[model samples]
Target chain A: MVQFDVTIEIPKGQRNKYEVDHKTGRVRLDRYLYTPMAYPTDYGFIEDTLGEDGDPLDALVLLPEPLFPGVLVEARPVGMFRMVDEHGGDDKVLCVPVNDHRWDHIHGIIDVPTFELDAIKHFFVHYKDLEPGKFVKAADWVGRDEAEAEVQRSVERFKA
Target chain B: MVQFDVTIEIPKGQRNKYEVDHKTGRVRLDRYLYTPMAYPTDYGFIEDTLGEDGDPLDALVLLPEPLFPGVLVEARPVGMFRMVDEHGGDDKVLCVPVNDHRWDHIHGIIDVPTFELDAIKHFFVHYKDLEPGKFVKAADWVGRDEAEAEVQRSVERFKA
Candidate 1:
């Protein structure tokens, strides 16, 4: 299935960012978003998958409210924000909470609201603006099929 | 000085439970709450501390909102729930979020709402009731000083 679990690292509306310390299995504060604005949605990583950067692929949960960091949420990949930083393709997967029936209808990117989608894109494009010599760009969004394939590749990447 | 970080495994008002798989450094579903009810407060473990059970010392955050599993919250020890299960003493440390100033006044157990404290006690005492051959009892609640000392001791025990 296209479903997997996401570990929320930075919840919605929070400036503080956190990351998992792989060496110690503890979550630690990574940094604050350089921009004054905060994440528009719940952000974290897909488990058991490594991306181009050799870290768990970044993911964003579509829920409106902020969830606390470290909560494991069952999610179904709905789309992706095709993004790139200085390192390269750092696409952010978009997902809907699988266990919550209220979001059952959101099976694909098109089901996501335009306003929310734009907000996510806007936030990412400018989040690192205040930081010295750091930059991120959102190229476009890809739909569910490509997103699911990416997740599968990420799992394979981790195994290798 | 008593501040420490907690990785939330089970959240308040949740029936599903989770745990960190230390070897793999991933969060996994441990089990469901055996009772018909749920955790009354955010539950997790204090990092770098081992208990009599040979696991990280259990801790509970006093926030009403259920945080996501794997999220780390900086906490200040406020009390201890002297609980024992089938194996041995498994005291659950009580805390308030150190970053959230709203909880700054709650420096000790007595500052916690009476009803909330009772609810936490009631939940723990019966949470494992439906599981066969399992039993848990709440001895009493201890104040901040003893709780902080216990945390300190747990840290030393983990190092040993």
Candidate 2:
């Protein structure tokens, strides 16, 4: 089992992201306006890990409904998409719930579909258009083993 | 003497941001089509720090020259500018080299001039303007103690 912990920041179907107030530790639903885009899946970041973008490692959850901000979920990495933008690049790890049978069937990146992953890539491709360039792209998909490895590395990077 | 480590992606004076090839651990200078503007300071992010944007803790290294990618420099936080963006927001912690005499005079965020700080603020006010919202602003300048606390918090966030 490639289990990992994720904290939801932006639930599915929300046009904007919900942010945490570091000082007060209060979660607030904030607004985003670049495009009318909403996440295709439950999106969040891995705790105690740092992504290349200098933020917590991002994770996309394949679930039926949206999760609340700060809600911790245990999931396993099934696949991943790597993206680069003006502010460095990071891997968007796609994970399925550990206990839920709906996604439990997925064991790695290859098990995921092209359209679902394509939707993920398309979101980033235009979400940040003309940050002076369209250099942003979703470059690749990695397997469960590599996804596990990356998650481990981020956890280790956070440890160091 | 508070000290921190920053990883330079887009060194000062360059328009493009450098990226890390996660799988290969290779560093590449990636181009961004944002504003053709240059960094006002040696901008980077603190290692192991995950910021609001899912990136490392963003930093502005105040130095005269630009360091190459993957260059880790020792610096101390002077002050931090808090800004709100479409993706929530993160503080751009301004720091000067621990050994650099030029910026040594800056002991706190208040010690920096309004013009210089405004320039830094101004840059972000327009750097990535794709989001339709206009809720962006560098509302406040936090002191050295507060700014240092933020750095420590990120470090602990990585730890947790």
lDDT of 2 by residue, B1-160 (tens): 8787776666667777677654465677765736667777767677777665555678887765555565566788998888876657668888887754456578997788889888887777776664355447545678889888888888877777
Query: What is the C-alpha lDDT profile of model 2 across A1-160, one tens digit per residue?
Result: 6687888877787665556544444443333424667777888888778765466788988887788767899988887778766666678888888888777567777677889888887876776552344457446677777888889888888887
Highest-DockQ candidate: 1
Q: Candidate 1 — which residues are off by over 4 angstroms?
A: A1-160
Task: Identify the candidate with maximal TM-score.
Answer: 1
Regions of candidate 2 where Cα sits further than 4 Å from its true position: A21-24, A28-30, A130-138, B1-160
> Candidate 1 has which clashing residue pairs, if any?
A69-B71, A70-B69, A70-B70, A70-B71, A71-B68, A71-B69
Q: Model 2: which docking level applies? A: incorrect
The lowest-lDDT stretch of 10 consecutive residues in candidate 2 chain B is B130-139
Candidate 2, TM-score vs. the true structure? 0.47
How good is the docking of model 1, by CAPRI class?
incorrect
User: Against the true structure, candidate 2 has what lDDT?
Assistant: 0.73
